Design a protein around this ligand. Structure first.
Ligand code: CL
Ligand code: ZN
Lengths: 29, 21
């Protein structure tokens, strides 16, 4: 796998891909 | 947070896993 910059909706799409059925929390500061 | 970690700098898919429930 690789590192990358993930911003805005792209970050949330990545979380969906990684966590899937587990669910996730998106909590910006 | 996740935004400083992954947007401002770069992050790995493994670090994203830290935010799974
Ligand atoms: Cl964009
Ligand atoms: Zn875009």
């Amino acid at each position: 796998f690789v590192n990358q910059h993930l911003c805005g909706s792209h970050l949330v799409e990545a979380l969906y891909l990684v966590c899937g059925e587990r669910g996730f929390f998106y909590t910006p500061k | 947070g996740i935004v400083e970690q992954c947007c401002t700098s770069i992050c790995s898919l493994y670090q994203l896993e830290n935010y799974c429930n």
